[model samples]
Target: MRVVIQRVKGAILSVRLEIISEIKNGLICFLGIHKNDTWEDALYIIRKCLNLRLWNNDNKTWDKNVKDLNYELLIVSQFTLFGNTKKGNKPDFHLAKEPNEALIFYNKIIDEFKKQYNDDKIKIGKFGNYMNIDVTNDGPVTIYIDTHD
Candidate 1:
């Protein structure tokens, strides 16, 4: 499993020019499921996403996680994160998990996220759909993690 997390002040996600999901003062996580990912991989991504301190608390900077501030999260499934571009201009998703299996794993992770945090705080994009997201990145911070690594 892999994830790219971005600290955003606000974000609006649109599909087919229709707004589908949005958030304020939180993180936008793009998750990629590997073909060989396990439950442990999903667990690790969930734990890290909810606990990483990417926010400033009072006078302390980068000392608070989203849960501490009661912020929201926008989770999107992105298989292109596994696109292998080592070859030509074309990228291949040979390393990405199959769509059916990945969706099952992704939903389980989402449930775990809501269980560990506030259910209302968790927002999600339409799975397997094209999304156009507008984000104002806080601190312009971006974090990448791969459970396999």
Candidate 2:
């Protein structure tokens, strides 16, 4: 499993031009499930997403996490994170998990996220659907993680 996490001042996620999920003062996570990803990978993503200290304290930089600030998170499923463009012009998505299986696994991860934090704090985009996210980066901070790595 892989994830690109961005600290955002705000985020609005839309599907088919209709807004479905939104958050303020938190992280926007673009999650990618690999073909061989397991529960451990999901747990790592969730824990890191909720715990990474991307926010700054009053006089300190990068001293607090989203949970510590009582902020919200927007989680989006993005299989394209595994797109392999090494050889040809065409991007290969063979490393990404199949849509159906990935959806199930993604939902389980979201459920676990809610279980670990406030249910109201966890927001999500429509799985396997084209989405548009308007996000304002806080500090423009971006973190990338691969559980297998």
Candidate 3:
């Protein structure tokens, strides 16, 4: 499992002129499930995302975790994280999981997230939807994390 987490001041996803998901003053998580990803990887990645300390404190350094500052999240499914670049000019998605398994894992992650944090502030993007996201990076802080690490 792999995730690209970004601290955003605001974001909105649009599908056919309709906004599907939006968030303000929180994190935007782009998650990708590989062919061999499992529930264990989901747990690891979610925990790390929730506990990341990217916010700045009085010392002018990033020292506050998401929970410490009470931040929300907008999770989006993006399976193109690890594309096959060695084969052709276009990207190949052979490394991603199948649709059925991916959906199961995606729902499982949301369930686990809600279980761990009872506030239920996390909003998720529609799985397998054609959409465009309008995102503004707060501090432009972004990082990519892999559970297998």
- Model 2 poorest ten-residue lDDT run: 49-58
**Tens-place lDDT digits, model 2, residues 1-149:** 99999988899999889998889889999999999998999999999999888877889988898889999989888999999999898989999999999999999999999999889999998887788899999779999999987
Count clashes in each candidate, considering only residues at least 3 apart in sequence or on different chains.
0, 0, 0
Off by over 4 Å in 1: none
Per-model TM values vs. the true structure: 0.95, 0.97, 0.93
- lDDT value, residue 54 of candidate 2: 88
Clashing pairs in 3: none
Per-model C-alpha RMSD? 1.0, 0.8, 1.3
lDDT against the true structure, per candidate, is 0.92, 0.92, 0.86
Q: What tens digits encode model 3's per-residue C-alpha lDDT throughout 40-101?
A: 89998889888888889897687887778877888888898867789878999998998888
- Using lDDT, give the best candidate's number: 1
By TM-score, the better pick of 2 and 3 is: 2
Candidate 3: where are CA atoms >4 Å away? none
Report the lDDT tens digits of candidate 1 across residue range 1-149: 98999999989999989998899999999999999998999999999999999987779987999888888999999999999999998999999999999999999989999999988889998898778999989889999998877
Candidate 1 weakest ten by summed lDDT: 53-62
Model 1 misses residue 7 by how many Å? 0.4
Off by over 4 Å in 2: none
Which model scores highest in TM-score? 2
Candidate 3 residue-wise lDDT at 53:
85
